[PDB]
């Protein structure tokens, strides 16, 4: 209790220095050879690249400025980079470089070669409770860290969780991360993971991350989400109804934890009560969890992904490749001045 309090105080001091004076322009495009796409999204893609002078591999997120502007994502993109360059935690992907050119924004991260949790989860089907609990503990600690800095993460899902070479989680995709001391209103996230208060255009706070943790633990342990359908609208209807059914194999402890996380009533949702994150850490489902040992990465991982060597992408799906164009004219220069 005393060690954590001090740890968090120092962590905030470190974060605030970088939040106040962010790193900028720490590489350029011709310092890397682009190899293969690791994942695609609405504003661009993430590519495996090799840094020429070091020989190191990295994962380069490329965002088309014009697409960002068209989708009204300027502030979110500025949030993403400002926050990711300032944070430091064992389960958060490291931003190694960032820069921009006439056409694009670039965030170059450590390459996490084990692939998305998503792919392993879908292939294997579901994770056992101890396997799911190992991952869940890392997310609990990560949210304790992020929330202490007044950050809301807002996109927890297996697609945004990478497995590292030691079998631990690296959270990626800070696209919707935001530093906020009051409530906020943006409808964003991923449909299956949205808390009811997001859907109902209520203001909301960090409690939405704890709801999303409930969804993640359920999906990890069940192999499917607690609220699923063919279309987002049908998903939202189910979320707002709030009724959750559990697989026959779920432990009583798991069901109890999930009823308290997937709680529509904010005055009752775990992570949001007087005792905060401790209601979760002290829950019976987590009785076997050594929280400090997880933080220190001393716990044996349930699953260690296959790695053939540097640059191996076997743990990722293949994607269609596209030329990276850079116009001779600067696009959206003023908008992205601080990036």
């Amino acid at each position: 209790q005393e060690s954590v309090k001090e740890f968090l105080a120092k962590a905030k001091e470190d974060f605030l220095k970088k939040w106040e004076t962010p790193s900028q322009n720490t590489a350029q495009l011709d310092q890397f050879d682009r190899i293969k796409t690791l994942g695609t999204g609405s504003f661009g893609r993430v590519m495996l690249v090799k840094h020429k002078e070091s020989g190191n591999h990295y994962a380069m997120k490329i965002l088309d400025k014009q697409k960002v502007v068209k989708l009204k994502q300027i502030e979110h993109t500025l949030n993403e980079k400002r926050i990711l360059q300032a944070v430091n935690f064992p389960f958060l992907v490291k931003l190694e470089f960032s820069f921009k050119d006439n056409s694009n924004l670039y965030m170059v991260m450590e390459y996490v070669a084990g692939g998305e949790m998503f792919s392993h989860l879908r292939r294997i089907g579901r994770f056992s409770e101890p396997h799911a609990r190992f991952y869940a503990a890392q997310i609990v600690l990560t949210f304790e860290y992020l929330h202490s800095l007044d950050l809301i993460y807002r996109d927890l899902k297996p697609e945004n969780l990478l497995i590292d070479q030691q079998g631990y989680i690296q959270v990626t995709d800070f696209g919707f991360a935001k530093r906020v001391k009051g409530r906020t209103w943006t409808l964003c996230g991923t449909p299956e993971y949205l808390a009811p208060e997001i859907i109902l255009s209520k203001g909301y706070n960090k409690a939405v991350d704890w709801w999303a943790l409930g969804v993640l633990i359920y999906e990890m342990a069940a192999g499917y989400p607690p609220f699923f359908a063919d279309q987002p609208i049908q998903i939202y209807e189910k979320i707002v109804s709030g009724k959750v059914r559990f697989p026959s194999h779920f432990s009583s402890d798991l069901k109890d934890l999930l009823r308290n996380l997937l709680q529509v009533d904010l005055t009752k949702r775990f992570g949001n009560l007087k005792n905060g994150v401790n209601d979760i850490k002290n829950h019976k489902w987590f009785a076997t969890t050594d929280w400090i040992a997880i933080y220190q990465r001393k716990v044996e991982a349930p699953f260690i992904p296959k790695f053939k060597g540097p640059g191996d992408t076997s743990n990722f799906d293949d994607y269609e490749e596209e030329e990276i164009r850079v116009s001779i004219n600067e696009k959206c220069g003023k908008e992205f001045t601080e990036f």
């Binding site: 994942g39 999204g41 609405s42 989708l71 009204k72 994502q73 979110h76 998305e116 998503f118 879908r122 996109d155 899902k157 697609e159 995709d173 696209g175 919707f176 943006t186 409808l187 964003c188 996230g189 991923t190 449909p191 299956e192 069940a222 192999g223 499917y224 989400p225 699923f228 359908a229 063919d230 987002p232 059914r245 697989p247 799906d317």
Partner: peptide
């Protein structure tokens, strides 16, 4: 089964964010 209904649904692949 709930599993079968999920696997037959259109949202078993990677899910994009919404904004």
């Amino acid at each position: 089964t709930t599993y079968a209904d999920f696997i037959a649904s259109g949202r078993t692949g990677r899910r994009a964010s919404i904004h």
